[PDB]
Every structure is written in C-alpha cells, then in structure tokens.
C-alpha cells in the first residue's frame, strides 16, 4: 500500500533505500546548519577574532555553557580561564545572534560536551553546576546533566529519564506569556482645540446659556 | 543614532563600578542588570532581549 495521486505513485522507492539522514541533522531541537553558520560568523564578526583563534573561544564558551545555563535571559559576561587569570567576553553577541534560540545553537556542542564531562571525570570529581542545581544524586549521570543535551536515539534509557526529570523539574509549569505592554502608550486623543484671548476658561470658551437668575 | 553606543557605554561603565544611569534611578528599576537598557533614548532593535523590551 503505497500512496497514489491521480493513479500515479507519490513516492520514489529508489531514493528511499539510499537515504541516510543520521537522525540528528533533520531534528527540530538542533538548529539548521545555515543558522548555526550565521551565528558562528556573526559572533566572530562582533569579537574581532581571527579564524585560527576562534575555536579556542568556542572551547571556552562550551564549558561555560556546561556550567551555567543557555537560557535566553543570559546577560553579562562569560568567563574563560586563561592560565590562572580570567577573561570576560561579552554575552551580548551570543544570545543576540542565536536565531532559533541559544538552545538549538548549543545543541551542536552536545556530544562534545558529553565527552568533555567524561574527560573531566577521569581526573577529578567534576559534576556540572546545572546538575548541582537540579540536585542529581547519581554522579555517574553528570555526563548527561547539562542544560543543552540533545537526546539522541543512542543514549541510555536511564539517561533519557534523568534528562526528562531535570527538564520537568526545571520548567515548573512556565506559563509562556505572549505579549507585554505595547508601545502605543497614547490612549487619549489630541486636544486639537484652539485657545483664544476671548475665551473664558482654558477648558471653556464662553458660558452661553447662563441666566444669572 | 547614539543608541547602541550608549548601550555599550553603560556596560563599559558597569565593568568598573556600579553605574546605573539617572533615568533608571528616576524610573526606580530595581534590576540593575537592565541598566544597560534603562536610558531615555533607547532604540528598540529586533536583536534585544524580550525582558529588555
């Protein structure tokens, strides 16, 4: 049973065997390649950083977004550790140029951040801040306990469960309001009326039926 | 015309010291992080936060 249109087959069987979209590149949770491309060029354009020097800054940004959250209300400066000192890059271009949201941009960094948590847990106990806020008592699921994890089909079901529990604990029935006050503040019409030296009051031309009786 | 330059100037002054512009002190904005947006002549661009709008 294959779909018909005017007696003609709607589908191409031959292309259907040779189609391997690898399940991640056609997701909605991950932003499109052109949008991440425009984001990566626009944040480089606003930092004045050469193309050689930019991936370092992305390595720093990924880690910072592991620790803190990739909410769209992110403001201020984000910190990268150069040796012992801190550098403070502005957050403005990052949330400014992220076109769908910052989550779908940062979901490109998902498995690399996932392996970075494991690389940091090789040396020392490294649980990301977001897992410390969500109060995940496990510790071995700290590899999955960050803000922008993109749930692939090749993840454990216990990791699915942990991520969905952290997401549902995090949202707490957020009523997504659509509008806030609008900029058309003027609710009263113009006082187009002409003032005159002949006028009696500013708000009154000339008493006309007053009988003084 | 001076909108985004003033916007970045508030951030540059908040790097050093707590610098909230007077207009935000008159409007009694309790936030402090939105002092970057709390001036009289801000030109609301599409690339601004919705909380700043």
């Amino acid at each position: 049973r294959m779909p018909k249109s005017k007696g003609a087959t709607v589908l191409n069987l031959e292309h259907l065997l040779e189609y391997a979209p690898q399940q991640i590149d056609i997701s909605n949770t991950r932003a499109t390649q052109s949008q991440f491309d425009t984001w990566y060029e626009a944040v480089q354009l606003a930092y004045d950083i050469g193309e050689t020097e930019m991936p370092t800054v992305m390595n720093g940004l990924m880690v910072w977004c592991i620790e803190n959250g990739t909410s769209p209300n992110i403001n201020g400066v984000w910190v990268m550790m150069d040796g012992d000192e801190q550098v403070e890059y502005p957050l403005k271009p990052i949330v400014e140029n992220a076109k769908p949201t910052l989550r779908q941009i940062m979901a490109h960094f998902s498995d690399v951040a996932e392996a970075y948590i494991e690389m940091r847990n090789k040396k020392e106990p490294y649980m990301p801040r977001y897992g410390l806020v969500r109060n995940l008592r496990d510790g071995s699921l700290a590899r999955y306990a960050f803000d922008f994890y993109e749930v692939t089909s090749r993840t454990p079901v216990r990791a699915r469960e942990a991520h969905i529990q952290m997401k549902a604990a995090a949202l707490k029935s957020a009523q997504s309001r659509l509008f806030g006050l609008d900029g058309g503040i003027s609710t009263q019409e113009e006082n187009t009326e002409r003032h005159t030296t002949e006028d009696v009051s500013p708000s009154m031309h000339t008493l006309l039926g007053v009988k003084n009786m | 015309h001076f909108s985004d330059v003033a916007e970045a100037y508030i951030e540059m002054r908040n790097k050093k010291e707590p610098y909230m512009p007077r207009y935000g002190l008159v409007r009694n904005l309790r936030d402090g992080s939105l002092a970057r947006y709390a001036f009289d002549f801000y030109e609301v661009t599409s690339r601004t936060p919705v909380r700043a709008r």
């Binding site: 606003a46 930092y47 950083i49 370092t56 150069d82 550098v87 502005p90 | 970045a8 540059m12």
Partner: peptide
C-alpha cells in the same frame, strides 16, 4: 586567548 574590548569597532 584574546582579551576583548567593550566598544570595539566593526559595529
């Protein structure tokens, strides 16, 4: 790791 300016150019 480059230091950054606040009112840097190309804006």
């Amino acid at each position: 790791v480059p230091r950054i300016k606040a009112i840097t150019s190309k804006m």
